[PDB]
């Protein structure tokens, strides 16, 4: 029969695989896809040839099985088959474990069984099996006083956490992270890595970040953790500022200094990933190509910076976004076009391209969003609910109310809480506006809805980090006061004297910090800045000179963005009074004229 040496078959299996990796970035048609998988097929079959037609030692069997199964996991849907090979390997290793050093191999079998296979499966049923068995494994290993098994137990505690995340067991995740982190050596690369996983998970869910995790993040040392993981730290610190609408100047400068001194490290290390040596013979490789590669990282940072400036809109900060989102877009297009091997699966490159495409979708989305802010009209879907949010806002802009649109969006299960809450707040604003202008007949159906929608806002806000976002906290205060006090509404909702003082006290904090001449500081969101000063000027200011100066500023500020004419008109009524009281003839004339001009535009 036709024969080859055992090493020749092994090297052929490797050659077929490594050659597929070498052309993995060159698949542009069905033909190329057939050839790519034709190679992988041969590689797998050659590996199978070794396992079925040869007598392999435990180490040989381990190596061959791992390389083969690696392909089953990354190239195929044959997960059950992969699992059978690893399970078989595991049982064989256990038979020789007494007289042969095989711990490394056994632990890798468990990693494939509990981490790699379940994640690729992405099945809830198998996630539960994995989590159950993983906890069983950890329990068994912590009972071994040996340092090797103690460290391995830590790795699989981390696997368990990742399984909890996929199962969306958020209370268990937090509990597991804390228990996991508490057992790690302090100021170690391993602990700081896990803490980064923790913070990122919390940000993904917009959960409040505990103080200790925050301090742990800030204490992360570059020279202990390496330039790759530190870039991730810096990125996360940027996202934190973005989520709280904080200032990013300091955080930008940190990235700047980081790049100046560690650019070369990222470029020379590009592709090789990040290796965390937990112990001798316990090394974890971490890959985050968007963050670990220099070009990809700057591209992400430029996106985050631009998103942070969207709300600014009309000023120099806004102009930055309009200028550099196109750059992010074009850069991303080139990253897709010039994607390289290797030697990684075509399917790895495929997932990276999919993420690149999402970035393109973010660029378009925020382009539309910034224009909507600027013009007061709507003319992507990178995240759930974004498309129908823009559609709902379009209806509201057209005086359609869009209650049903917002309500349905706030009720869908796939949408983030942030989108749900934007929908609920706009919905509350509409309903509160209707309570004000509608007759006493429909007042009954409108106030309950206000109270209903409001409790929903409070509930979601209380379980997100938005409660610590001053823009969001101020919006809540403003909307409550507008809906509970004359002359901001014709029919204010009922409230206790304690509630009034509560919200009036919140207003005082935001207004004293953001008055037209400290984390009460609001970004220069035009509409927000005007409403807070309007509300503060009406409720908190007594001096005529101060009231006039504020009303004048509010009045004039409205011109900076479209869609502000009805707001400006109401502000105009207020300013006219202040002119009338102050007996300022010239200012009465100009203000009346401006009101007349606004009426003509509005009633078109």
């Amino acid at each position: 029969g036709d024969k080859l040496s055992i090493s020749q078959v092994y090297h052929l299996a490797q050659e077929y695989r490594d050659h597929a990796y070498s052309i993995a970035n060159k698949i542009g048609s069905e033909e190329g896809l057939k050839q790519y998988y034709g190679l992988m097929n041969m590689s797998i079959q050659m590996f199978q040839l070794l396992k079925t037609k040869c007598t392999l030692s435990v180490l040989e069997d381990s190596k061959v099985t791992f390389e083969m199964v690696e392909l089953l996991i990354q190239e195929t849907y044959n997960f059950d088959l992969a699992e059978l090979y690893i399970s078989s390997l595991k049982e064989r290793l256990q038979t020789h474990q007494s007289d042969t050093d095989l711990v490394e191999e056994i632990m890798r079998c468990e990693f494939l069984l509990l981490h790699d296979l379940p994640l690729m499966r992405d099945s809830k049923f198998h996630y539960k099996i994995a989590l159950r068995n993983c906890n069983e494994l950890v329990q068994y290993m912590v009972n071994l006083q040996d340092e090797l098994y103690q460290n391995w137990a830590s790795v699989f505690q981390y696997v368990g956490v990742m399984l909890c995340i996929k199962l969306k067991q958020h209370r268990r995740v937090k509990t597991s992270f804390h228990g996991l982190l508490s057992q790690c050596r302090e100021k170690s690369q391993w602990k700081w890595f896990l803490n980064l996983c923790y913070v990122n998970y919390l940000l993904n869910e917009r959960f409040p970040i505990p103080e200790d995790a925050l301090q742990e993040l800030r204490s992360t040392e570059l020279h202990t953790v390496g330039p790759e993981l530190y870039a991730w730290k810096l990125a996360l610190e940027m996202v934190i500022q973005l989520c709280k609408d904080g200032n990013i100047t300091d955080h930008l400068n940190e990235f700047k200094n980081f790049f100046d001194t560690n650019k070369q490290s990222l470029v020379t290390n590009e592709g090789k990933g990040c290796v965390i040596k937990i112990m001798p013979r316990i090394a974890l490789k971490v890959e985050l190509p968007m963050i670990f590669h220099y070009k990809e990282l700057k591209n992400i940072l430029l996106l985050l910076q631009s998103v942070s400036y969207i709300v600014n809109c009309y000023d120099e900060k806004g102009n930055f976004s309009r200028k550099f989102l196109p750059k992010v877009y074009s850069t991303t297009q080139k990253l897709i076009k010039n994607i390289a091997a290797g030697g990684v699966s075509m399917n790895e490159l495929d997932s990276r391209i999919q993420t690149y495409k999402s970035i393109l979708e973010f660029c378009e989305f925020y382009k539309v969003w910034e224009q909507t802010l600027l013009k007061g009209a709507v003319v992507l879907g990178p995240s759930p609910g974004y498309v129908r949010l823009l559609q709902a806002m379009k209806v509201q802009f057209e005086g359609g109310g869009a209650v049903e649109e917002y309500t349905r969006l706030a009720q869908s299960g796939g949408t983030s809480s942030e989108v749900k809450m934007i929908s609920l707040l706009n919905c509350y604003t509409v309903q509160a506006a209707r309570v004000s202008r509608c007759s006493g007949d429909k007042q009954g159906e409108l106030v309950e809805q206000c109270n209903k929608v409001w409790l929903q806002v409070e509930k979601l806000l209380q379980e997100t980090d938005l409660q610590f976002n001053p823009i969001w906290e101020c919006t809540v205060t403003i909307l409550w006061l507008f809906s509970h006090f004359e002359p901001f509404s014709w029919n204010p909702l009922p409230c206790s004297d304690k509630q009034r003082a509560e919200y009036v006290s919140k207003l005082r904090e935001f207004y004293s910090s953001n008055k037209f001449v400290n984390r009460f500081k609001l970004k220069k969101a035009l509409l927000l800045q005007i409403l807070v000063n309007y509300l503060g000027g009406r409720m908190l200011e007594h001096d005529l000179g101060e009231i006039y100066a504020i009303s004048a500023k509010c009045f004039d500020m409205c011109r900076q963005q479209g869609g502000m004419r009805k707001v400006q008109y109401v502000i105009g009524i207020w300013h006219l009074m202040n002119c009338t009281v102050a007996m300022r003839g010239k200012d009465v004339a100009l203000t009346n004229a401006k009101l007349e001009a606004l009426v003509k535009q509005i009633t078109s």
Binding site: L4, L236, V286, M290, S383, S483
Partner: protein, 122 residues
């Protein structure tokens, strides 16, 4: 309650225009609330954590082992073993045998019938 505004007359007061601030917001989305969903996840993915296993095998030059190399459409359990490769969402680009060793090329050609590879979507 009394306020000077609603008491005194002004342009548009008789028109259908909001005279109080909450009514002015009925057709104005609070668009300064810029959603940030997906951005944190963008930092977090794509991400891979793996266990590198670097151990050389088949190094003994004296090794004498060699290998004999000459070797449905209904829902079945046998399809567990039959390989199904992953249809990718994208093409990674807008003759792949080139570079293969002669032996690799020869074995590939001899077993061309076994290359009726099935590619499927999730």
């Amino acid at each position: 309650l009394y306020f000077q505004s609603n008491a005194m007359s002004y342009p548009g007061k008789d028109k259908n225009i909001p005279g109080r601030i909450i009514e002015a917001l009925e057709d104005l989305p609070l668009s300064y609330l810029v959603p940030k969903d997906g951005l944190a996840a963008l930092v977090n993915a794509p991400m891979r954590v793996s266990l590198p296993f670097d151990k050389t095998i088949f190094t003994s030059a004296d090794d004498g082992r060699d290998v004999n190399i000459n070797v449905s459409s209904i829902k079945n359990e046998a399809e567990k073993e039959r390989l199904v490769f992953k249809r990718p969402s994208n093409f990674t680009s807008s003759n792949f045998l080139e570079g293969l060793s002669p032996l690799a090329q020869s074995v590939l050609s001899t077993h061309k019938g076994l290359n009726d590879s099935i590619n499927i979507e999730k």
